[PDB]
Design a binder for this molecule. Structure first.
Ligand code: TIU
Ligand code: TIU
Lengths: 219, 220
C-alpha cells in the first residue's frame, strides 16, 4: 500500500486498484470561443494547470494505473442534450451552434477535443458524458467494477462543476477519492478552493485532497 | 403557469408537472446525538429553517403538487452501506452504532425519522437513499418520469452535501430546479452561501434560487 500525506488524514492506495480520472480537459473549456466562453466566462485561469495535469498523467502511466479521460459532449443530432441544457442562460451561441472551433460541445468537433498535451493513448478509457457528472448516462461505474478499481485520483476542470459532481457521485458509489488540488481549476477563484474545502470537511465527507508533490513523494 | 422572480432570471413552472423535493429533514441531522453530531458538527444551525420548510410543504400541498421526501438511511444489516462510508473519518460512534436516538443512520430507528413537524402525508413519495444524491440507487427518476414531472422545487439539509448533490444530479437528468434559499441550511454558513452562489452562477448552470417569499408571491 502507498500512503500519501493528504487532507483531512492520510490516503492509502494500491496502484493496481486505483484509476486516475482526468475530467473534461477540452478546448471547449480551456480555449477562447468554445462552450466556456459562450457561458460568459474568462477561460484564462484553466490553462495554468495543464503542465501539472500532464505530470499527473505521466505519473499514472509510469505506475501502470488505469487512466480514464472524460469529455463533456453531445451526439451530433443532440439526441442526448436535454432541452433544459440547450436553453439555460439564454446564450447568444449555444450547444450545437457553430463557434470558431466548430459546433459548441458536440462530439467530433475540433473545439470538443482533449488538449494534445493531455491526449488519451491506447489502453486508456475515454468516456463521453452528456452531463457534468462522469457516472450519469455512462458505463463508467461498470467499467471500473470490471477492473476491480476501488480508489480514484481526480483531476480536471472545472473544480465546482464536473470535478465536484463526479467526485460526489463516486463517493456515493463507494470509491475512495483523492483530488489533486493543483491539477484542478475553476473560472472562479470564489469557487475553486472552497469547493476543495467542502469536499474534505467533516473528516473527509466526500474524500481527500493533496497537491501533486505529495502524490509524487509516495510513488 | 406560475412565474417566480428568481436568480439568475425568472423561473416558470406549472403545478401539474412540478414536484417539491424535501431532502433529509431527519433527526439524524437536526437533533443532537445523531449522524450529524457523530461527524463532529454543531447541529444547531439547521433547526432555524424548520418553520420555513413547513410553510413550503403547506404551499405545495395547497397547490396539489407532488411532494417527495428523502431520508439518508441504510438497511439494518448495512448491506447498502459501502465500507468506505462506514470507515470515513474514523468516528467514535459510526453508522449503525447506538446513539441516544438508536442506531445512527439506520432505517426504522427513531433518530433516522423525518422530524414530526415535516412528516409526509398519504400520497407523498418517501425515498430512502444510501448516498447523498437523491437519484443514486433510488427509483426517484423513474417515479418522476412516470408522472411527467419536468420541474423541481428543492429544500432541505445540508445545502453543500445532499441538497447540492441532488440538484446537480437532477440538472444532469434534464429537470429545471429552483432551490428555496431560506428552506436550506448547512452546519457551515460559508458553505451554505457559496453553494447557493455556485448553483446559479454562469447563467444558472445548475438551476435557480429564490427565497420562499418570492414563491409565495407567485401562487398568491
Ligand atoms: N461551466 C463550467 O464551469 N463547467 C462546465 O460546464 N463543465 C465542466 N466540465 O466543468
Ligand atoms: N454531513 C452533512 O453535512 N450532510 C450529510 O451527511 N448528509 C446530508 N443529508 O446532507
Amino acid at each position: 500500500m502507498i500512503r500519501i500525506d493528504a487532507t483531512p488524514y492520510p490516503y492509502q492506495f494500491h496502484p493496481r486498484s486505483t484509476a486516475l480520472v482526468v475530467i473534461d480537459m477540452q478546448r471547449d473549456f480551456i480555449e477562447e470561443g468554445g462552450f466556456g466562453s459562450a457561458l460568459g466566462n474568462d477561460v484564462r485561469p484553466l490553462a495554468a494547470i495543464v503542465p501539472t495535469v500532464a505530470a499527473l498523467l505521466q505519473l499514472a502511466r509510469e505506475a501502470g494505473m488505469l487512466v480514464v479521460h472524460t469529455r463533456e459532449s453531445h451526439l451530433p443530432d443532440l439526441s442526448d442534450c436535454p432541452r433544459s441544457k440547450r436553453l439555460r442562460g439564454n446564450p447568444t451561441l449555444g450547444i450545437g451552434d457553430v463557434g470558431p472551433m466548430g459546433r459548441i460541445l458536440v462530439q467530433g468537433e475540433p473545439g470538443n477535443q482533449i488538449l494534445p498535451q493531455l491526449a488519451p493513448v491506447e489502453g486508456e478509457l475515454v468516456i463521453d458524458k452528456p452531463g457534468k457528472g462522469a457516472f450519469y448516462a455512462t458505463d463508467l461505474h461498470a467499467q471500473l467494477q470490471e477492473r476491480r478499481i476501488t480508489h480514484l485520483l481526480v483531476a480536471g476542470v472545472t473544480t465546482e462543476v464536473s470535478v465536484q459532481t463526479s467526485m460526489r457521485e463516486a463517493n456515493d458509489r463507494g470509491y475512495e477519492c483523492l483530488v489533486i488540488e493543483d491539477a484542478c481549476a475553476s473560472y472562479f477563484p470564489d469557487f475553486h478552493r472552497i469547493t476543495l474545502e467542502m469536499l474534505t470537511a467533516q473528516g473527509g465527507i466526500v474524500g481527500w485532497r493533496t497537491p501533486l508533490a505529495q502524490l509524487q513523494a509516495g510513488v
